[PDB]
Amino acid sequence: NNYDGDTVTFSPTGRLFQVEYALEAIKQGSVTVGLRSNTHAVLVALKRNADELSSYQKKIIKCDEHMGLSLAGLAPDARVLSNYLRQQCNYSSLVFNRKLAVERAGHLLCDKAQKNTQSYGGRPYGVGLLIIGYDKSGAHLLEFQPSGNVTELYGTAIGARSQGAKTYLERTLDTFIKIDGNPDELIKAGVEAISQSLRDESLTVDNLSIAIVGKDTPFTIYDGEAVAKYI
Amino acid sequence: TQQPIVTGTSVISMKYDNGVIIAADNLGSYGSLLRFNGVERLIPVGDNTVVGISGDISDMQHIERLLKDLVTENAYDNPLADAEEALEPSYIFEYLATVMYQRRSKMNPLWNAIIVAGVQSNGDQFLRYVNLLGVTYSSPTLATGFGAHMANPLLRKVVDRESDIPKTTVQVAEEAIVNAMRVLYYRDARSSRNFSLAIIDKNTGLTFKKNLQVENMKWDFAKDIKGYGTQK
């Protein structure tokens, strides 16, 4: 393949192979699930560790009091994108006394990702993101790919073997859609969904991370003993 | 701007139980010359906000252009632009105050004093002031320049505390505003008889009245005034 050298080269069929390789980098990451109802939004993440003596890699990053995300793929790219999102939310608050909408942040991430796939000297990002938030329009969940595509969904999953969780979410859509005012039930639904992507491991207090945002709930992260009641 | 050239006079405003009222005259003066008549100094931004501007007219037109640009930018990629994602008076005031303070920090100020009035989405009234130095403040009644010396004492008669706001109807507030405008026309040498008024209410919509003239005045007693001191 002579067309995969850089990001400014189309293939004869019209494919960008560096973008596809970044997507492949995503597909080898740990599974994360995002879910929402009319009042709350939830992220569930399975961590990974190098070995037993090592700690587990963090997967959930807080962007603002009403917004956060979980990552799958290359972590430093997630850090870069999260810092950019934090700066944008801070700018919105400082200049307009306004809470940045989730859709606008998705647009900003799409625009920032597009510029890295059209000019020489730069690679596309190597991470996929699930973004949850609560704003004046309610709860929102977004999925971001490094090709620049951003989609708004009721629920989704990314990473290795996420198809089972996605099928579970698609089957039980009408159930978790209407879990309003009961955050624990939504968290348990998300945990059950992420249980569908496990093959040779079980959820423990060391490898499970949860995040929640809602109508009266700021973006909060639970890990360790704080998730012991959801296992 | 280092020195204003064409300038507008005071803008006055007050809050009542349901909404806010703002008013300003239609004169652009040129160094003691009453040069331009028919200058609208109240700019409605949407349906819930009115911005009243005093000072340099060219900077006022620049600010109007900025506000229109802000509305257009807010409408982009926003299906809820006519909904819960519409612009609010708080957003507009924060943006304008940021601009004023940044331009003051560069020794290139916009020689203006601005009152933003409106009604928030939750129904709360909004009324705030920012000038060419970036100084901002809020009060149940607001006025800049000359009006701040004569309109405020009258308006504070009607609404002297925050507790007086629920007692004030729209009719009383509008009568007070009109009387203050008449007093300003009596005693301000850079003022005009023609003015515009705007009412922003939480139940009803924005009401923008133009071509309002100061009504029946007291001039008859002038016939009794003879020469100064001892004449006649």
From Swiss-Prot, chain A:
Cellular component aspect of the GO annotation: nucleus; proteasome complex; proteasome core complex, alpha-subunit complex; proteasome storage granule
Keyword Phosphoprotein: yes
Keywords per UniProt: Cytoplasm, Isopeptide bond, Nucleus, Phosphoprotein, Proteasome, Ubl conjugation
GO BP field: proteasomal ubiquitin-independent protein catabolic process; proteasome-mediated ubiquitin-dependent protein catabolic process
SUPFAM superfamilies (alphabetical): N-terminal nucleophile aminohydrolases (Ntn hydrolases) (SSF56235)
Covalent cross-link Glycyl lysine isopeptide (Lys-Gly) (interchain with G-Cter in ubiquitin), where: 188
Gene3D superfamilies: Glutamine Phosphoribosylpyrophosphate, subunit 1, domain 1
The keyword Nucleus is annotated on this UniProt entry: yes
Localization per Swiss-Prot or TrEMBL: Cytoplasm; Nucleus
Modified residues (Phosphoserine): 11
The family this protein is said to belong to: Belongs to the peptidase T1A family.
Comment field (misc): Present with 7210 molecules/cell in log phase SD medium.
Biological function: The proteasome degrades poly-ubiquitinated proteins in the cytoplasm and in the nucleus. It is essential for the regulated turnover of proteins and for the removal of misfolded proteins. The proteasome is a multicatalytic proteinase complex that is characterized by its ability to cleave peptides with Arg, Phe, Tyr, Leu, and Glu adjacent to the leaving group at neutral or slightly basic pH. It has an ATP-dependent proteolytic activity.
Subunit structure: The 26S proteasome consists of a 20S proteasome core and two 19S regulatory subunits. The 20S proteasome core is composed of 28 subunits that are arranged in four stacked rings, resulting in a barrel-shaped structure. The two end rings are each formed by seven alpha subunits, and the two central rings are each formed by seven beta subunits. The catalytic chamber with the active sites is on the inside of the barrel.
Listed name of the protein: Proteasome subunit alpha type-6
Species annotation: Saccharomyces cerevisiae (strain ATCC 204508 / S288c)
UniProtKB/Swiss-Prot annotation, chain B:
Protein keywords: Cytoplasm, Nucleus, Proteasome
UniProt entry tagged with the keyword Repressor: no
Top-rank lineage group of the source organism: Eukaryota
Any one of the GO CC terms: nucleus
InterPro entries: Ntn_hydrolases_N, Proteasome_beta4, Proteasome_bsu_CS, Proteasome_sua/b, Proteasome_suB-type
UniProt xrefs under PROSITE patterns: PROTEASOME_BETA_1, PROTEASOME_BETA_2
Keyword hit for Nucleus: yes
GO biological process: proteasomal ubiquitin-independent protein catabolic process; proteasome assembly; proteasome-mediated ubiquitin-dependent protein catabolic process
Gene3D superfamilies, alphabetized: Glutamine Phosphoribosylpyrophosphate, subunit 1, domain 1
Subcellular location: Cytoplasm; Nucleus
Additional free-text comment from the UniProt record: Present with 16900 molecules/cell in log phase SD medium.
Family membership noted in the UniProt record: Belongs to the peptidase T1B family.
Complex and partners: The 26S proteasome consists of a 20S proteasome core and two 19S regulatory subunits. The 20S proteasome core is composed of 28 subunits that are arranged in four stacked rings, resulting in a barrel-shaped structure. The two end rings are each formed by seven alpha subunits, and the two central rings are each formed by seven beta subunits. The catalytic chamber with the active sites is on the inside of the barrel. Interacts with CIC1.
Protein name as it appears in the record: Proteasome subunit beta type-7
Organism: Saccharomyces cerevisiae (strain ATCC 204508 / S288c) (Baker's yeast)
